[PDB]
Amino acid sequence: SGAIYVGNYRVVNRHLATHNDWANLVWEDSSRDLLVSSTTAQGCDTIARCDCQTGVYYCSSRRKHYPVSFSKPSLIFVEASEYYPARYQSHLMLAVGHSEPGDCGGILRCQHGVVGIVSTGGNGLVGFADVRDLLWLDEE
Ligand SMILES: NC(=O)[C@H]1CC(=O)N(Cc2cccc3c2OCC3)C1
Numbered sequence: 001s002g003a004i005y006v007g008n009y010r011v012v013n014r015h016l017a018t019h020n021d022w023a024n025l026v027w028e029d030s031s032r033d034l035l036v037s038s039t040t041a042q043g044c045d046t047i048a049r050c051d052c053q054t055g056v057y058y059c060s061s062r063r064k065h066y067p068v069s070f071s072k073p074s075l076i077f078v079e080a081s082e083y084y085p086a087r088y089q090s091h092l093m094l095a096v097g098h099s100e101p102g103d104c105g106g107i108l109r110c111q112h113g114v115v116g117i118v119s120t121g122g123n124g125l126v127g128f129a130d131v132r133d134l135l136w137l138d139e140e
C-alpha cells in the first residue's frame, strides 16, 4: 500500500483505490495503473520534473529503502495478476529489486522529488508507474 500526497491530490495504484477515492475522483488510467483523488488537507510530497534514471524506492516487504537504476518510462508486458489480465502497461519503468504484491504504493524518488510508485514485481524485478509527466499535479 502507499500514496503520493501532493497539493490537494492523493495518487494511488488504481488497483488499490478505495470507495472514497472513486467518490472523489480526479483522474484514472487503467493502462498506467494510476488513480488520483482529491483531498481536504494539503500534502507535503513534491513531484520530480526530470529525466533521472537513478533513485531510491521504499520496499514494505523488507522495511527498507533501496537505491536503484531504472529504465525510461515505456510500454512493458506485465504478467496476469489478481487485479489485471496479462497486458501491456504504459509509462512503466523497471529496476532490479525486491517487490511483492503488497509493496505497490511505495515511493520511488530522486534528488528532484517523487518519480513514481511501485506497481509491478516478481523474478527479482520491481516496476514503477511514472508520474513525472503529470504536470497538472503541481497546480489547481
Ligand atoms: N500493475 C499491475 O499490473 C500489478 C497488479 C498486481 O497485482 N500485480 C502483481 C504484482 C505486483 C507487485 C509485485 C509483485 C506482483 O506479482 C509478483 C510480485 C501487478
Ligand SMILES: [Zn+2]
Residues within 6 Å of the ligand: 048, 049, 050, 051, 052, 110, 111, 112, 113
Ligand atoms: Zn530527478
